[PDB]
Amino acid sequence: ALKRKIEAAKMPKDAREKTEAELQKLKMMSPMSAEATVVRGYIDWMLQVPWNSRSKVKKDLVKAQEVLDTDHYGLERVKDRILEYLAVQSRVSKIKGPILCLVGPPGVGKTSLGQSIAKATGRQYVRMALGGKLIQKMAKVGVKNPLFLLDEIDKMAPASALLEVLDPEQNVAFNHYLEVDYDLSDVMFVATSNSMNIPAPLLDRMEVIRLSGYTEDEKLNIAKQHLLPKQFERNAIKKGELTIDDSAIMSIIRYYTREAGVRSLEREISKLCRKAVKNLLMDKTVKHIEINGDNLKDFLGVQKVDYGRADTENRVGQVTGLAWTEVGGDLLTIETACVPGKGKLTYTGSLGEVMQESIQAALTVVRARADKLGINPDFYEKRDIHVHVPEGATPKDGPSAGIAMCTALVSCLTGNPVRADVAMTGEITLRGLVLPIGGLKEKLLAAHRGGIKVVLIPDDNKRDLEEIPDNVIADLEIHPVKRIDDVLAIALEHPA
């Protein structure tokens, strides 16, 4: 009747005797009842589950190298970290250790990269978004060893009981509505997110691999080798047309988009493609359409965001700070004002108490250096001070852009304009020393992507400064400082 299928599917003895256990009850109940059919479909969940048939892994890492570098362009500091794990995965058949975690801003390519690892080893691919399910996907793949991605763990917070799916002390047996334990070992996992706000039990078993942003040369080669072909084949543009030159793509990246990823570049290229197709069917005169860096304004619209700096350095108060934010790297305009009053401070803009302590730090920096800047020496009680920080900074990052507040106060008191192609950062002491800060690569990618051309970083980050690999350094005039007097001599457009 029905037993002659499950007798050859080779489930183990536990699920075999459960399957026969409700099966002979099913054969001895009415074969057309409603509860009987509930048991029929209940067994039909258990025909789905692949208790055998491992798909073969591939050990030669040369074609693993040649299968990663044929799909994604330039994540050279990540592919080493992924071939560590595939190397030990090649020798040891079953790693029980921690799990690859991929963290970066959205648009970098993490969902594609977890899709690419499945092509690298040989195993299948099932993506599981997060905002029974797991046996539905394991049944959906029909194989024992998939590459079961777990995307947006950061957007997850059953509440969080997946931590028994991760540790090998629990993965020898996982039951929930099927109530037969599955051997979830030899099911390789890759997890992704958008920040390291992963819940503290889950972070134990996860190797954080960072995927920082892309730069303009790197985005240019991405659009020239891996985006224009897949967009030209998902809209079926014929081969002998749509020559998009490089300067046009440089104007799309520089003027029409702002993200660390290449998500919005796909929107702009796709809209460019179908506008070109519409100009191919609404006319039979032209067939070869070329779009240079000039005629986008006649073709795509108006230059939505700004890139250059001819932007009136006579701003008295505001400087441009960098910020290693939750979503990566970002520009930030920190503003201060000085009004007549009694001497009271005013915090504005997600200032936790650490930034309050650095505000009074910078206040003591200024008051220590009153007379050799020309400031009225009794400003701390004639004139109130209002300091503004736009939000975005993580509270661990915090007193980064501390000296932006000090140059902002010196500039607001003496009326000396801060030159506005200076992306200051740093962490100030009381007495006038500038401490190191972490995440220098996000701050430099954001300082390059907005077209800032002079960056001030602390002196004790001449260490990570060499490890920025690309030509980011080659056109940015990065030069460190250590005291506040090297900052005040440079970021103001007058001597002091």
- Residues identified as active-site: 400, 443
Question: Which of 430, 473, 490, 496 is in the footprint of a copy of itself by CB under 8 A?
Answer: 430
SS3 178: coil
Provide the minimum distance between the beta carbon of 415 and ligand ADP in the complex, in angstroms, as a whole number: 45
51 vs 131: CA distance, rounded Å? 29
427 vs 433: CA distance, rounded Å? 8
Provide the minimum distance between the beta carbon of 73 and another protein in the complex, in angstroms, as a whole number: 23
Provide the minimum distance between the beta carbon of 73 and ligand ADP in the complex, in angstroms, as a whole number: 4
Provide the minimum distance between the beta carbon of 264 and ligand ADP in the complex, in angstroms, as a whole number: 10
Is residue 448 within 8 A of residue 215, CB to CB? The reply is: yes
325 vs 336: CA distance, rounded Å? 21
The nearer residue to ligand ADP, 27 or 274, going by C-beta atoms, is 274
Q: Does 350 bind a copy of itself (CB under 8 A)?
A: yes
Provide the minimum distance between the beta carbon of 126 and ligand ADP in the complex, in angstroms, as a whole number: 15
Provide the minimum distance between the beta carbon of 302 and a copy of itself in the complex, in angstroms, as a whole number: 5
The two structure tokens encoding residue 472: 């980011």
459, HSE (Cβ side, Cα atoms, 13 Å): 9
The nearer residue to another protein, 28 or 281, going by C-beta atoms, is 281
Pick left, alpha or beta for residue 242 (phi over 0 → left; psi -120 to 50 → alpha; otherwise beta): left
Angle between helices 263-281 and 246-255 (to 10 degrees): 130
Residue that the structure tokens 């009381």 belong to: 430
Site string for a copy of itself, 217-246 (x = CB under 8 A): -----------------xxx----------
Q: Does 414 bind a copy of itself (CB under 8 A)?
A: no
Is residue 328 within 8 A of residue 370, CB to CB? The reply is: no
Q: Does 317 bind a copy of itself (CB under 8 A)?
A: yes
112 binds, among a copy of itself, another protein, ligand ADP, none (CB under 5 to 8 A by kind): ligand ADP
The nearer residue to ligand ADP, 388 or 441, going by C-beta atoms, is 441
457 vs 112: CA distance, rounded Å? 34
437 vs 34: CA distance, rounded Å? 66
SS3 269: helix
50 binds, among ligand ADP, another protein, a copy of itself, none (CB under 5 to 8 A by kind): none
DSSP single-letter state for residue 163 = G
The nearer residue to ligand ADP, 3 or 226, going by C-beta atoms, is 226
Residue that the structure tokens 């183990």 belong to: 12
The two structure tokens encoding residue 251: 């104007």
The nearer residue to another protein, 41 or 158, going by C-beta atoms, is 41
Contacts to ligand ADP from residues 96-135, by CB under 6 A = 106-112
Q: Which positions lie near another protein, rule CB under 8 A?
A: 34, 234-236, 277, 281
The nearer residue to ligand ADP, 111 or 414, going by C-beta atoms, is 111
Supply angle C-alpha 110, 114, 115, rounded to 5: 110
The per-residue b/e assignment along 62-93, b for 16 or more CB within 10 angstroms, e otherwise, is eebeebbeeebbbbeebbeebbebbeebbeee
Q: Which stretches of the chain bind a copy of itself, using CB under 8 A?
A: 61-62, 65, 80, 83-85, 87-88, 90-92, 97, 131, 200-201, 234-236, 271, 274-275, 277-278, 280-282, 301-303, 306, 315-318, 333, 335-341, 346, 348-350, 353, 357, 360-361, 364, 367-368, 370, 377, 380, 384, 386, 388, 412, 429-431, 433, 460, 463-464, 466-467
Q: Which stretches of the chain bind ligand ADP, using CB under 6 A?
A: 72-75, 106-112, 222, 226, 261-263, 266
